[PDB]
Amino acid sequence: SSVFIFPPKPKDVLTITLTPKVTCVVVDISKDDPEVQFSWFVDDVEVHTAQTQPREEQFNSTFRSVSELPIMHQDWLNGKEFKCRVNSAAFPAPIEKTISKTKGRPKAPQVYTIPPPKEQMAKDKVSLTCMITDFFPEDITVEWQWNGQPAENYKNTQPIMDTDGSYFVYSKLNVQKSNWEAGNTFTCSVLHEGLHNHHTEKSLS
């Protein structure tokens, strides 16, 4: 069992009413292993407000242990370091994991939308595209809105670093024929620390 640590949801970090949290996970544990113990520190000073989930059997019959450290929005943006120190019997020494915002001047992303390619219109299931470029750091949230309501039928590619140090991402929203030309409006909502108001919208029809 190897330990992983995850950044907070970019959306959570930017919305005052949400609660950003750092996540530590010990996956691939043997039903036989003793419960792992977690320990957290914010800038090398231990904190005691984390909550660790019970323990859940995953898809490969083994388990995972999740621990969440709720944090302050500002601490993530100001670059504080978050350390998860996990140990147990099945570990000679404890494993330590670290994570913190990528450092550098934030850069605002360029958000563009793309209506179905000329050649796809011939199908009975098309796809709208949101093309987000030149942002930094990589933390970003991209979602789609049908008219004004959520849309769960979309996929975002993981951010990739272009040659120049910035990142890009594509979001693909699928829509069974119809809708597109004759129908409801489609909006690409992006949240990033580099945007004016930290958020922006672009819509298609």
Nearer to a second copy, 36 or 188 (CB): 188
Q: Tell me whether residue 68 or residue 193 sits nearer to Cl ion (CB atom).
A: 193
Q: Give residues 120-179 in contact with a second copy (rule: CB under 8 A).
A: 145, 148
Residue 129's binding partner among Cl ion, a second copy, Mg ion, none (Cβ under 5 to 8 angstroms by kind) is: none
Which of 93, 77, 114 lies closest to 188 in space, CA to CA? Answer: 114
CA torsion 108-21-155-3 (nearest 10°) is 120
Biggest alpha carbon distance in the chain?
63
Q: Up-side HSE of residue 118: CA atoms within 13 Å toward CB?
A: 0
Position 198 contacts Cl ion (CB under 5 A): yes
The entry of Cl ion, a second copy, Mg ion, none that residue 172 binds, CB within 5 to 8 Å by partner kind: none
Say if residue 193 carries a ligand binding annotation.
no
Q: Are 158 and 144 in contact (CB under 8 A)?
A: no
Tell me the C-alpha distance between 1 and 91, whole Å: 9
| Least CB distance to a second copy at residue 18 (A) | 10
**Binding partner of residue 16 among Cl ion, Mg ion, a second copy, none, CB under 5 to 8 Å per kind?**
a second copy
Binding-site residues for Mg(2+) sit at: 57
